[PDB]
Design a binder for this molecule. Structure first.
Ligand SMILES: [Mg+2]
Ligand SMILES: [Mg+2]
Ligand SMILES: [Mg+2]
Ligand SMILES: [Mg+2]
Ligand SMILES: [Mg+2]
Ligand SMILES: [Mg+2]
Ligand SMILES: [Mg+2]
Ligand SMILES: [Mg+2]
Ligand SMILES: [Mg+2]
Ligand SMILES: [Mg+2]
Ligand SMILES: [Mg+2]
Ligand SMILES: [Mg+2]
Ligand SMILES: [Mg+2]
Ligand SMILES: [Mg+2]
Ligand SMILES: [Mg+2]
Ligand SMILES: [Mg+2]
Ligand SMILES: [Mg+2]
Ligand SMILES: [Mg+2]
Ligand SMILES: [Mg+2]
Ligand SMILES: [Mg+2]
Ligand SMILES: [Mg+2]
Ligand SMILES: [Mg+2]
Ligand SMILES: [Mg+2]
Ligand SMILES: [Mg+2]
Ligand SMILES: [Mg+2]
Ligand SMILES: [Mg+2]
Ligand SMILES: [Mg+2]
Ligand SMILES: [Mg+2]
Ligand SMILES: [Mg+2]
Ligand SMILES: [Mg+2]
Ligand SMILES: [Mg+2]
Ligand SMILES: [Mg+2]
Ligand SMILES: [Mg+2]
Ligand SMILES: [Mg+2]
Ligand SMILES: [Mg+2]
Ligand SMILES: [Mg+2]
Ligand SMILES: [Mg+2]
Ligand SMILES: [Mg+2]
Ligand SMILES: [Mg+2]
Ligand SMILES: [Mg+2]
Ligand SMILES: [Mg+2]
Ligand SMILES: [Mg+2]
Lengths: 119, 52, 50, 71, 87
RNA sequence: AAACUUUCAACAACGGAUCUCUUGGUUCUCGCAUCGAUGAAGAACGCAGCGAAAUGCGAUACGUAAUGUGAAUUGCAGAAUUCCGUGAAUCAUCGAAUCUUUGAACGCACAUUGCGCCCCUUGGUAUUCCAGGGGGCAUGCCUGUUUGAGCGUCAUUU
RNA sequence: AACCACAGCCAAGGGAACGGGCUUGGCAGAAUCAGCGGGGAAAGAAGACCCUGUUGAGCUUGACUCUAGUUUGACAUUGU
RNA sequence: AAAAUCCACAGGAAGGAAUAGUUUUCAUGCCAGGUCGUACUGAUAACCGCAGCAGGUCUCCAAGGUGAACAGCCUCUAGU
RNA sequence: CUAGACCGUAAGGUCGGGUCGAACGGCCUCUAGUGCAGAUCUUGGUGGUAGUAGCAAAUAUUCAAAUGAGAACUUUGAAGACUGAAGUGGGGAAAGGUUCCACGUCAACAGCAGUUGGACGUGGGUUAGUCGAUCCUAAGAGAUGGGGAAGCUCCGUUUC
RNA sequence: AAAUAUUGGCGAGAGACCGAUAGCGAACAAGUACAGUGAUGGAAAGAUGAAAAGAACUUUGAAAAGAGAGUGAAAAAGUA
C-alpha cells in the first residue's frame, strides 16, 4: 500500500531515517527477486514510499531552517519567494508609494473631490 | 495564410534537363526533393491570387 | 573506432536500446494507431552521423 | 556472471555509472559485510556499469550470492 | 577521379557533436558550432532563416520551467499551501 | 477453323479517384501581461511489472507532498480494509519539494564524462598522502567593510 | 531502361518546294525466330554556330561616372 | 623540433654524538594506485562511393625453389 | 457501373437496373479558390517495350552422406584447385557501431536459389597502477591587461 | 495614465473560409523519417464494424494459405 505522509509527519528525524534505510533494504531485496520473478509490482510501491519519506524529511528540515531565519533579514535564497525575476526586481509597495513632502502637501490640500451635476 | 506555398527555397532547374521549368525543391533523400513548387498548378504550391 | 570517447559510446548505447520492433501489446491498447516502429534504424541502411 | 560466482570467488554487480572502484569496494563491504580483494569495472554496451568484485579467500562467493538471494 | 574515387577519402570529420545543441555541427578546428554558435554566449539565429528559428525556438523542447509560469500567474504567484484537509 | 489483336459487357484484378465524414488548418474579433544567475529557452542522457516513439518526469525520475473529487486503471499481469473512506484514479487542482549532465553557465577545461584549490567531516597508523561525504572558488559594475599604495598631499613631533 | 500523337509496304504526284497516312497506281493472307543497320529527316539536349533582345557576365582601356589607397594645402591638436 | 620531466655537479645554508647522537639515493618490510576506451570488420560484403559497386582508403610481420631480385612461375603454414 | 430508356441543336437533364450506406435535392435569389486534352504542366497511379536487354572481369568445380517440404549453392567427409608471405594469411590506425557470439528462425533482403547469412527475432558479450587517453610542448588556437569597433565583435599573447 | 500597435505568448468567441494532392510543411510517434561535412533542406502517411463479435471447429497443404464451418445488418466490411 505504501507509507502515508500524514503518518510520517508525526515522526522524529531519527525514525524517518531508520524507515528510509529499511525501505532501501526492501527495494534492494526486491530488485534481487525481480531477477527471477517475471513481473514485480511491489517495486513501485516501495519506490514511492522512499520518495514519500524523503519528501517528509526535506519538509521537516526546510521548516526548521525557516524557523531559524524567522523574522530576520537575509533569508536563504531557496527559502525566499520564487515569484519572477522582474517581480523580485520591482520596487516594494513602500518604495512605490513614496512621495516628496511637497507632493504630499498638495495631495492633502487639494485632493480630487466628489461632486455631481445635479443642483 | 500569406506564407502558404512559399515556405520553400525551391528554384527552377532551367532548360536542358528534360523537365518543365517550374521551380523545384532542392536537396535529396525525402521524396519532396525535386518536386515542383510555388505554382498554382503545383501540389502543395501557392494558390492563384491568394485571398486577402 | 575501438578507441572512442565516452560521449560516442553513450550515444551508441542509446541507439542500441532503441534498436527493436514495436512491443506487441501496444497494438492491443484502446484507440491504438501505432502500426510498427517507424524510427527503426539499422547499421546497414542509414548511418547515424555520430 | 554466475559461473564466475562459483569459479572465481567473484560477485558480478550492476552498479551506478557515477560509482568508482573505491565506492564500489566500500559499498560491497557495507551492504554484504564481505572483504573485497579486487574490483574490475567496465561500461556495458547498454550504458550500465558492471563491476567484477572478487572477494578474499576468507569469503565464498556462493554463500554470499545465496544470502543476497540469487541462485 | 574527382568523383567516385575521391569519395573514398572521406574518413575525417569536420564537425562533431555540439555541447550546447547536440547537433554534430561543432566545427572541430574552428571550435564553433555552425548551428547554435557555441561557444558564443548568444544563440546563433537569423531572420532570413525563419525555418531554422522555428526548429529551435521556445516551445520545441520541454519548457521545464516556463510551462508552469502561466498557471502561477493565474493564481497570482501565490505562496503557502491549500488550507483544508478533506471533504 | 483456332490461337492472336481489337471493341463491349459481366465477374475478378490493379490502383486509390469519387462521395460522405473531420479531436486539424486558416482568417476575424475579444480579454490578459507572466521567461532568466532564486539559473531560462534549448541540448544530452536516463526513468514504467511488461515502451521503440509521442507525452510526462529527473536517481524522490510516466513521478513525491499538498488540495479537491469520490471508486477507479485497463492491452495483459498485479494489487484492491482504503471502497460509509484523510480515499481509487495515466483524475482534476497545485501554493511544498525533488529537479541527473548541461546550457547566458559561473573553479580551470571540455573532440577529455580531463584537471585543480579552499572549509567541514569520516576512514585508512595521517596539518602534509590516498579515499569517501557535505559546502564552496567566474566576470563587469554599484553601495558599504576591512587591509593597503603613492615626497599626490596636511598637521605632528627626542 | 531509352523511347512512344496515332502508327508502321512501296512508286509517282501535289503539298511548308524529300509522305507511313493525302491523290493515282503497284499490291495485299494468321502467328513468328536469328540477324541487320537503308529508312523511321530514329533516340540523347528548349543549337553551344548565326541573328534578334533596349537580357547578362568575364576581361581590357585614353569609354562614361566614381572609389579604396596615396600625395599636396589649410584649419585644429599647438604650447614657450 | 620544442617542452614537460629525470639526474648530476658547483655552492655551503643549516643540522648532528653517545655507546651507537644523528643521518641514510644500501637491503628488507607495510598501504594504495581513480576516471574513460578495450567486442568485431578494416574492406571484390562491416569504411566512403544512392548498393552486398572490378573504384577509393594509412600502416606492421613475410617460409622453400628458380632467379640478380619483395620480378614472373610452382610450392609449405594459414585462408578461400 | 450500366453498346437499357426518354427530353434538349447543345452545354446538359431525367428514368430504369446493379453496387452502396447517410445524407441530398427542385425553384427564387446571393456569392466564388466555379467547368481542362494539351502548359518538355504538378502529384500520384499505370502501360507497350518485355518475360525483352541482360544476370559473361577476379582460372573451378566434382562425388557421397547428413539435414530438410524442398539442396548446383547449408554442413561434414572425400577430391580437384587457387591466393603463393608487398597474400584471398595474421593484426591494427581513420570510419562504422554490435556488424562480434549463441539460440530460434526464412515473409522481406542476399538482382538464381537458400535449410545458409553482416538478414529477421531474442539474448550474451568489451574486466588494466604497468596498453592508450589522461601530462608535455609543435605548427598553431586563444582568454586577460589594454586598445579598436554603432555593434555583432576585432587586434594582440606579454604586451604601455 | 488613456485613446494607438500587436503574423509572438496565454485565455476565449467566432466564419457565405479549406475539407486529407485542399487547409499551416505537419489532422497521424511532423519540423518527425530521410539527405547533406555544414549552413540548411525536409516528406509521405486519416476512415473495418454499433460492437472484435478480429473467423472456435473440420479438412487439404511442409507452410503461407485454400475449401468448408462460423461472427456480423452486411465479409459485395477479413486490419492488403
Ligand atoms: Mg519510481
Ligand atoms: Mg496549400
Ligand atoms: Mg567523451
Ligand atoms: Mg571504465
Ligand atoms: Mg577499464
Ligand atoms: Mg571521377
Ligand atoms: Mg570539383
Ligand atoms: Mg579541417
Ligand atoms: Mg537547473
Ligand atoms: Mg494528472
Ligand atoms: Mg496524344
Ligand atoms: Mg491516326
Ligand atoms: Mg512520318
Ligand atoms: Mg482526301
Ligand atoms: Mg491506296
Ligand atoms: Mg536507320
Ligand atoms: Mg532554342
Ligand atoms: Mg539554349
Ligand atoms: Mg529596338
Ligand atoms: Mg563569367
Ligand atoms: Mg580487447
Ligand atoms: Mg580485441
Ligand atoms: Mg553519403
Ligand atoms: Mg641463387
Ligand atoms: Mg462503359
Ligand atoms: Mg455509417
Ligand atoms: Mg481555379
Ligand atoms: Mg487531364
Ligand atoms: Mg486546349
Ligand atoms: Mg536474355
Ligand atoms: Mg598456385
Ligand atoms: Mg596465378
Ligand atoms: Mg581484429
Ligand atoms: Mg542482429
Ligand atoms: Mg535471390
Ligand atoms: Mg526465395
Ligand atoms: Mg544459424
Ligand atoms: Mg556471424
Ligand atoms: Mg497536406
Ligand atoms: Mg453493405
Ligand atoms: Mg461491392
Ligand atoms: Mg463495406
Amino acid at each position: 500500500a505504501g507509507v502515508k505522509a500524514y503518518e510520517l509527519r508525526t515522526k522524529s528525524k531519527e525514525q524517518l531515517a531508520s524507515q528510509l534505510v529499511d525501505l532501501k533494504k526492501e527495494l534492494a531485496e526486491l530488485k534481487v527477486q525481480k531477477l527471477s520473478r517475471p513481473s514485480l509490482p511491489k517495486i513501485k510501491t516501495v519506490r514511492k514510499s522512499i520518495a514519500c519519506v524523503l519528501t517528509v524529511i526535506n519538509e521537516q528540515q526546510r521548516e526548521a531552517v525557516r524557523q531559524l531565519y524567522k523574522g530576520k533579514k537575509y533569508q536563504p535564497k531557496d527559502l525566499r519567494a520564487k515569484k519572477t525575476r522582474a517581480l523580485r526586481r520591482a520596487l516594494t509597495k513602500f518604495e512605490a508609494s513614496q512621495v516628496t513632502e511637497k507632493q504630499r502637501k498638495k495631495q492633502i490640500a487639494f485632493p480630487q473631490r466628489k461632486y455631481a451635476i445635479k443642483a | 495564410s500569406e506564407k502558404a506555398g512559399h515556405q520553400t527555397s525551391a528554384e527552377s532547374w532551367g532548360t536542358g534537363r528534360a523537365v518543365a521549368r517550374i521551380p523545384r525543391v532542392g536537396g535529396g533523400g525525402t521524396g519532396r526533393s525535386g518536386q515542383g513548387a510555388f505554382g498554382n498548378m503545383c501540389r502543395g504550391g501557392r494558390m492563384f491570387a491568394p485571398t486577402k | 573506432a575501438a578507441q572512442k570517447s565516452f560521449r560516442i559510446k553513450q550515444k551508441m548505447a542509446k541507439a542500441k536500446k532503441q534498436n527493436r520492433p514495436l512491443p506487441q501489446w501496444i497494438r492491443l491498447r484502446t484507440n491504438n494507431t501505432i502500426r510498427y516502429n517507424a524510427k527503426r534504424r539499422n547499421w546497414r541502411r542509414t548511418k547515424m552521423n555520430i | 556472471a554466475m559461473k564466475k560466482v562459483e569459479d572465481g570467488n567473484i560477485l558480478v554487480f550492476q552498479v551506478s555509472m557515477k560509482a568508482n572502484k573505491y565506492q564500489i569496494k566500500k559499498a560491497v563491504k557495507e551492504l554484504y559485510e564481505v572483504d573485497v580483494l579486487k574490483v574490475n569495472t567496465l561500461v556495458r554496451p547498454n550504458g550500465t556499469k558492471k563491476a567484477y568484485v572478487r572477494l578474499t579467500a576468507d569469503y565464498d562467493a556462493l554463500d554470499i550470492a545465496n544470502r543476497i538471494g540469487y541462485i | 577521379g574527382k568523383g567516385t574515387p575521391s569519395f573514398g577519402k572521406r574518413h575525417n570529420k569536420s564537425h562533431t557533436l555540439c555541447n550546447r545543441c547536440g547537433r554534430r555541427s561543432f566545427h572541430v578546428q574552428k571550435k564553433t558550432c555552425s548551428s547554435c554558435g557555441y561557444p558564443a554566449a548568444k544563440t546563433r539565429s537569423y531572420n532570413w532563416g525563419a525555418k531554422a528559428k522555428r526548429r529551435h525556438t521556445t516551445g520545441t523542447g520541454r519548457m521545464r520551467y516556463l510551462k508552469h509560469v502561466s498557471r502561477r500567474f493565474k493564481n497570482g504567484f501565490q505562496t503557502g499551501s491549500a488550507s483544508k484537509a478533506s471533504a
